[PDB]
A paper describes a structure:
The neuraminidase inhibitors (NAIs) oseltamivir and zanamivir are the antiviral agents available in France to treat influenza A or B virus infections. The NA active site includes catalytic residues (R118, D151, R152, R224, E276, R292, R371, and Y406; N2 numbering) that interact directly with the sialic acid substrate and framework residues (E119, R156, W178, S179, D/N198, I222, E227, H274, E277, N294, and E425; N2 numbering) that stabilize the active site. NAs are divided into 3 phylogenic groups: influenza B viruses, group 1 (N1, N4, N5, and N8), and group 2 (N2, N3, N6, N7, and N9) from influenza A viruses. I221 (B NA numbering), I222 (N2 numbering), and I223 (N1 numbering) amino acids are highly conserved framework residues in NAs of influenza viruses.
We are the first to report influenza B viruses, isolated from an immunocompromised patient after prolonged oseltamivir treatment, with good fitness carrying a novel I221L substitution (B numbering) in NA that confers high-level resistance to oseltamivir. We used X-ray crystallography to understand the structural basis of resistance to oseltamivir conferred by NA carrying the I221L substitution. Crystals of the NA-I221L protein in complex with both inhibitors diffracted to high resolution, showing clearly defined density for bound oseltamivir and zanamivir. The structure of the NA-I221L-oseltamivir complex showed that the L side chain protrudes into the hydrophobic pocket of the active site that accommodates the pentyloxy substituent of oseltamivir, thus causing a change in the conformation of the inhibitor such that its C81 carbon moves about 2.2 Å from the wild-type NA bound position. Viruses isolated from an NPA collected on D34 and a nasal swab specimen collected on D40 were highly resistant to oseltamivir (IC50, 1515 and 1776 nM, respectively) and showed reduced inhibition by zanamivir (IC50, 24.3 and 27.3 nM, respectively), compared with the first wild-type isolate. The Km revealed that the I221L NA variant had a 1.9 times lower affinity for the MUNANA substrate, and the Ki values for oseltamivir carboxylate and zanamivir showed affinities that were around 84 and 51 times lower, respectively, than that for wild-type NA. In comparison to the I221T or I221V substitutions, the I221L substitution emerged in an immunocompromised patient who underwent prolonged oseltamivir treatment and conferred an increase of >100-fold in the oseltamivir IC50, a much higher fold increase than those seen for the other substitutions. In our case, I221L substitution in NA of influenza B virus isolates induced highly reduced inhibition by oseltamivir, with IC50 values greater than concentrations of oseltamivir achievable in body fluids (ie, sinus fluid, middle ear fluid, and plasma) under single and multiple dosing regimens.
Residue numbers in the entry:
A (entry chain B), B (entry chain A), C (entry chain B), D (entry chain A): 76 to 465
The structure:
Amino acid sequence: EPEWTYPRLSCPGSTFQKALLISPHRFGETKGNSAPLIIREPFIACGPNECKHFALTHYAAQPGGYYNGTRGDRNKLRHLISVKLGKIPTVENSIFHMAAWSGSACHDGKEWTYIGVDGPDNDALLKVKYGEAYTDTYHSYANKLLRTQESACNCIGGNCYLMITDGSASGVSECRFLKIREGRIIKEIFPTGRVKHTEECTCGFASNKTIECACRDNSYTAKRPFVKLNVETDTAEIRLMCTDTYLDTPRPDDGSITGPCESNGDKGSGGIKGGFVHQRMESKIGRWYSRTMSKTERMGMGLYVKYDGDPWADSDALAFSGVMVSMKEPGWYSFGFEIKDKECDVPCIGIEMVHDGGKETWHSAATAIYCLMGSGQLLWDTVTGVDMAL
Amino acid sequence: EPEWTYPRLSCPGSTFQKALLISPHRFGETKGNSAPLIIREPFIACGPNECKHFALTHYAAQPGGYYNGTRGDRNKLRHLISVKLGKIPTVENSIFHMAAWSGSACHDGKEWTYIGVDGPDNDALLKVKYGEAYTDTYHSYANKLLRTQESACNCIGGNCYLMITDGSASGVSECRFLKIREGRIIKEIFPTGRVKHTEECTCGFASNKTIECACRDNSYTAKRPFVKLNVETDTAEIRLMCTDTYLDTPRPDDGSITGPCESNGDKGSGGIKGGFVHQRMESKIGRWYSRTMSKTERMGMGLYVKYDGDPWADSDALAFSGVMVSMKEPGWYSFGFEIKDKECDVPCIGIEMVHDGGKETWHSAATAIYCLMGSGQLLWDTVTGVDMAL
Amino acid sequence: EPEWTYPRLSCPGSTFQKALLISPHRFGETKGNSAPLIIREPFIACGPNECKHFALTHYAAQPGGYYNGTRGDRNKLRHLISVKLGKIPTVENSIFHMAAWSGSACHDGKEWTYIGVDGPDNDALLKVKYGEAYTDTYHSYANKLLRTQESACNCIGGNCYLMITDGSASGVSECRFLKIREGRIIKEIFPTGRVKHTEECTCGFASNKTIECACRDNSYTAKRPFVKLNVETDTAEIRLMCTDTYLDTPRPDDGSITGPCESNGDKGSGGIKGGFVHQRMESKIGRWYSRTMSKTERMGMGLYVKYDGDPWADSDALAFSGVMVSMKEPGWYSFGFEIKDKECDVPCIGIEMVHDGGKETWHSAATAIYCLMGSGQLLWDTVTGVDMAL
Amino acid sequence: EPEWTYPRLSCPGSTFQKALLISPHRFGETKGNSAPLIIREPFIACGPNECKHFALTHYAAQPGGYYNGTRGDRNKLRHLISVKLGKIPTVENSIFHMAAWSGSACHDGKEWTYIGVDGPDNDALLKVKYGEAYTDTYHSYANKLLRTQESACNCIGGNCYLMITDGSASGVSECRFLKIREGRIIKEIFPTGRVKHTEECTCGFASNKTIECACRDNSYTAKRPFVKLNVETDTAEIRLMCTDTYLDTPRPDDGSITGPCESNGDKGSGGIKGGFVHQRMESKIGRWYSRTMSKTERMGMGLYVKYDGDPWADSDALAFSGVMVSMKEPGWYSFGFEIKDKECDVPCIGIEMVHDGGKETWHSAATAIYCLMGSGQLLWDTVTGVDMAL
Ligand SMILES: *[C@@H]1O[C@H](CO)[C@@H](O[C@@H]2O[C@H](CO)[C@@H](O)[C@H](O)[C@H]2NC(C)=O)[C@H](O)[C@H]1NC(C)=O
Ligand SMILES: *[C@@H]1O[C@H](CO)[C@@H](O[C@@H]2O[C@H](CO)[C@@H](O)[C@H](O)[C@H]2NC(C)=O)[C@H](O)[C@H]1NC(C)=O
Ligand SMILES: *[C@@H]1O[C@H](CO)[C@@H](O[C@@H]2O[C@H](CO)[C@@H](O)[C@H](O)[C@H]2NC(C)=O)[C@H](O)[C@H]1NC(C)=O
Ligand SMILES: *[C@@H]1O[C@H](CO)[C@@H](O[C@@H]2O[C@H](CO)[C@@H](O)[C@H](O)[C@H]2NC(C)=O)[C@H](O)[C@H]1NC(C)=O
Ligand SMILES: CCC(CC)O[C@@H]1C=C(C(=O)O)C[C@H](N)[C@H]1NC(C)=O
Ligand SMILES: CCC(CC)O[C@@H]1C=C(C(=O)O)C[C@H](N)[C@H]1NC(C)=O
Ligand SMILES: CCC(CC)O[C@@H]1C=C(C(=O)O)C[C@H](N)[C@H]1NC(C)=O
Ligand SMILES: CCC(CC)O[C@@H]1C=C(C(=O)O)C[C@H](N)[C@H]1NC(C)=O
Ligand SMILES: *[C@@H]1O[C@H](CO)[C@@H](O)[C@H](O)[C@H]1NC(C)=O
Ligand SMILES: *[C@@H]1O[C@H](CO)[C@@H](O)[C@H](O)[C@H]1NC(C)=O
Ligand SMILES: *[C@@H]1O[C@H](CO)[C@@H](O)[C@H](O)[C@H]1NC(C)=O
Ligand SMILES: *[C@@H]1O[C@H](CO)[C@@H](O)[C@H](O)[C@H]1NC(C)=O
Ligand SMILES: [Ca+2]
Ligand SMILES: [Ca+2]
Ligand SMILES: [Ca+2]
Ligand SMILES: [Ca+2]
């Protein structure tokens, strides 16, 4: 007391609804007096008492004089930052956790674990922080580019599970899982199955026995690699999601990849991190996913659901369950997380809405949140409200 | 540790006095360095330990570049925000609770309940949040425009009661009440009586048995619909206030509506949300109300009181208690709320003082507060001090 | 637990030293990005866990557009505000307690009592707040200008004692004391003796039996009225301080008021609020006082001490104990307060250092703090560092 | 509940890695909206629950109008400030602890002790604060310039140990140590041995019996004076570090100082505060140190280590562990500190990275942090990212 936390049955509900928008650049005008941080790759993770809104900053504000380089991914300035969910992530409201150009975090019931990867591309370093204390590291194993989830890690009974990967962006990237306890890496887990390229896994609990993840293959396919990780045996297997509703971007037309479930198909090169979250019921499991409305561009974001079945074997379309972001608006990375009610867990999906005007201006993002709430159908979409000219 | 709260006897006193002004736009000059949020529909709710100042933001600051649209009511950016009462609601001080263009909130003794309506006009959606967790929703039942109080909900023994309404702004809007316990709707209450238009109810406890509300009829009368809700039987009845002192704006001359108490009279179309709060004594009930100084414009705010009687039956004029805002200053929405002293409750009325310069400039509000304190007569009025040209 | 607090023996020490400067206008440049509040009449009060830095704001920031009127004393915008001692009192860091143009506050061991006077000059109103709750008021008794200390009130065993006064600035102003318990006025105390003009009393505990105050006579003398208030009998007597070291400004030459201790003497018109704090030892009492270095202008601030004797009867000079502010710098109001160490109390004097460029610019103040610490002599003076042109 | 803290065994690890950069002036552009404080002499200290980032401010922000004087050391405006480690030290985020132009701080397990020296050069004064209470002072003993560590003090079983010194910058400065318990000085410690110039000691626990410090000789040598302080007997001895790897700046070529360990050698005048921190193992002690990459300029910062031996006697070169700051970036003061994990202590070194544009512009610093974490080799360097023209 505090005790370790475990996944619980989800709170009652049958549809997602628009919850909250964090749009810091609504206050970034030259005519204004604010200092929203320039960020990308936001995610959210919650503990028993609060939710934290994380991102990777370029250590620059709007308005400001350091826009050059903010459309790049890795440099010596990027840091993992957070605010309490609902606060605007400005220079003063934010806290800087560690130097990082790839990140994750999660709460185990007693304390926060923070994860940050930095260093040179060919010998990068994963760093683990438990509360205030730097407690461990893990090294690049392919010497191409070590990296992690860009979303919440997952803790059960004090054991926090985390995807890492290393490899070429356009070739092989075989992922691993780390088992981390009170900030220290106590096991490495080497998945079996379809392992040729797995990155940016969005993971969560299907049950007390099983973690599942929906990931990105940046090289070979528009189907998402789907991880099943058994936390009783510490073993993992990966296969492609068979659904006709391909969740990557870019992607070919739904159902158009012919042959069996493992077939790679066309337009596999490139990709995007995708939302995935679980609705755990007594004898039923809802799997909720998001994908861009556009097949080729990072525009729009749609929500989908399927109950039960085996995602490795089932070609049936996921059920469309609403436009979270219309195709007129940006829809970039998406992620899952869960908010802890008094006796049950609330599944949510967050959406990174990038403000992209190219390399000659600033480059950052808003965060939209949708959560399971009540019944019926999803009723309204999200806009950032930002005019990049101001 | 902690216990559910109940209404208590009011603290001793016999007059209201000027307490506190929150005027964020005193700091919004182009020459300044601050970021007060552009808001409307402020209200206040208190729990056992603190009071919170809530409002509906347009997700824009002064100074800034997003003034266009701030004189409108509903859009995809409006959010329910709060600060601790006494803090200036700026970009950084504020917390964003949820997307909402109509709102409410209340503390039950253990935790905050937050209420926000958003969605499209014909199928809007009321959302309930308990602490950090989104917990329930309620649907549009007239498909016209679902909406709520714009003031505090009211909790007793863990059951929080909330007015909602749905229907045409210039036609029929039959309200209902929701009973919400730990974030979930456990009962609907369908009022009887004079029900054809009730909105923006300002509600409080007359006793442990009864909640009363003074509301707005936007279509048919300048008399306020007056709700009596029995919390023991979970039933409600509504009739017009019979007092000659018509509390709406616009309104005709006092007492000039002829016929029985239910007669509607002249200047019924249009309206304004009105202040109302109870002073609960051992063998006596005081009802305190506010209305604009102008009969037809949102200018000034006067305080009135009457002890005992039946508001449905008594045509007696309310006793004029003093000028809270001069007819030279804006007087828009007003609301009641109660502060928890150690052993008794302090009744207060808040006043929204809108800065209205038309649709070619920014549109926002200050919040003035008067509370029951000491004896004698009300001594001083409130100004916003804001020059909209700066 | 929390229990009521009482004055304790003072911590060991024999000289004051420079502790801390709060100079918010060091960040008020047009070239800067900050919002220090425009204030005057600062004071400090501490409880068992923290110290609060209070002041009276004009509800305006530097830089800003509302400088006009900030060299005035009373208006409908002035408010009592505070920050945690050590924080810069800006728009966002501060909290607004109540509308007030005269103020006081104190902690009783369990909760804060806040005191604010506002209203029209001829019928002003003292308002009492206990925590968040407005709990009582007190009315003007001379209908000239009700006002209070502009420094900490004093609580013992739950009873908080407060000076109020009412009367002409250039004639009679007979003060009273209020005894306030958990926010409610439970006794009025009418002093005897030399009562013709007593205002802006700076008060503290000489012992568990006695509160003493050093006050301002704005009409008749440059000697300070000295209150002795017996908290066992709730009786008070006032006589002039007899010391040759006249503490008011303006003042004639030291010792130059001829005749007995009660003689008024010359240059009595005008005045200033003066610092006074107690050093309580086992069989000895140190009385520490401050006065401007200039006899006629609000420039400089010197510290003085005398041990034992009767301030009503003793003409001996107070011992000069250091320049806190040189005559080159502003020295306006001064006040006493005590910080609570684990087992003993630390006496301190604070100094308002007003930035005065006349009525055509902004008008505000810094706060300097000196406290009893160690042995020897007071070693360094304080400057605000502010160039009013920036 | 709570207990006094003691040094514990260090957490497992064998290399340092880049942890965190605090670079406030990334947000100080004329085009921006922030107010980073102008500071120098940053350090860090941690207690059982949080780490605090301390520095000495010139009481001025960037952008602003008070740059003149910010390249000086001592004045009446300098103050010791802090934020929680990871927050940007701005006007509003920071807390001002006391007036000080030399500083230290440390947590004893129950409460913070804050140390600040101010006053005139010939009779300066060290002030001790415990929590909010000013509790003691210490006087100048050489009347030249009393000063302290500019890094964390060290507490064991409630006794906090602090280096102080006094004397000429280019002549003799014989240091002493103070033993402070709950804010009060309970013992003086007068070192023996090589005492002619010791300042800016960076100190830590070698064990429960022994504190060690690596210090600056500004007059006579580029070898660092090295303190061994026995906390059981409260006595101290000092001798020069014998290592060929001279840690001061300026310095001659490594190993080029001929003669016995106490020989002073070439380029003795001038100096810099140096990083030093212990890695305490069961049967082994690691000593980690930092020095600039340039022999003569404050450019770059390299990390070094040696296990066991006697630093007074061993001429052996320290093992070069990696580049923390490239010779293209500023490397000024460095310091050691330790973070408290649940059951072990994590050693770190911090680096002040001064933005030096000469006396015609602003002068301030970023703070970079490296900590022991994992195994392998140190992988990445730190840049401030600041363009002083913006
Ligand atoms: C997973 O296992 C945990 C731990 O056993 C379950 O949590 C327990 O649930 C039971 C039944 O509600 C309670 O009596 C215990 O107090 C819970 N302990 C906890 C949360 O620490 C949890 O229900 C399981 N999750 C599932 C089935 O999804
Ligand atoms: C409404 O009911 C509540 C609950 O019974 C009353 O609160 C109690 O008041 C009594 C007498 O003052 C106290 O001894 C109890 O401790 C209170 N109980 C709780 C749980 O708070 C309250 O007084 C009633 N209010 C009115 C207006 O009658
Ligand atoms: C004034 O009276 C208070 C209350 O009696 C005294 O505080 C007590 O002091 C004794 C002796 O140190 C302690 O044992 C008690 O625990 C104290 N109780 C408290 C503070 O609540 C205080 O010492 C007296 N002040 C004087 C003599 O200046
Ligand atoms: C220094 O001494 C402290 C105090 O004895 C040691 O802390 C104790 O360590 C033991 C064994 O790990 C624990 O069982 C105790 O609970 C600790 N006591 C306290 C009061 O903390 C510490 O281990 C010693 N450090 C070194 C480096 O030897
Ligand atoms: C090049 C590797 C990887 C997969 C393409 O690039 C990611 C793609 C990104 C993207 O597609 O938007 C942004 C990520 N921040 C980046 N990750 C890292 C660690 O740089
Ligand atoms: C249009 C319905 C209703 C009655 C006219 O409008 C309200 C009136 C308002 C008003 O009269 O000032 C402002 C309210 N924000 C608005 N409410 C909503 C939900 O839009
Ligand atoms: C006119 C009454 C009183 C005594 C002169 O004036 C005070 C003097 C002041 C002064 O001498 O600086 C400032 C005080 N804020 C003012 N008090 C009030 C309540 O207005
Ligand atoms: C003048 C004495 C001392 C040694 C040269 O100067 C220090 C050197 C400094 C330096 O070498 O950068 C900066 C320090 N802030 C300063 N300390 C004080 C107390 O002024
Ligand atoms: C930044 O742009 C400058 C020109 O403005 C160019 O020299 C440099 O290569 C750019 N660097 C990065 C990392 O984009
Ligand atoms: C404000 O927005 C409306 C609706 O889009 C548009 O018609 C109008 O031109 C805008 N006003 C200005 C000043 O741009
Ligand atoms: C403020 O100054 C204006 C002119 O700038 C003048 O009309 C007015 O009287 C002033 N008011 C006060 C209260 O000083
Ligand atoms: C800075 O201050 C010094 C000392 O007062 C003065 O000599 C110099 O002229 C000042 N510099 C500028 C640019 O004003
Ligand atoms: Ca792909
Ligand atoms: Ca009407
Ligand atoms: Ca006088
Ligand atoms: Ca040297």
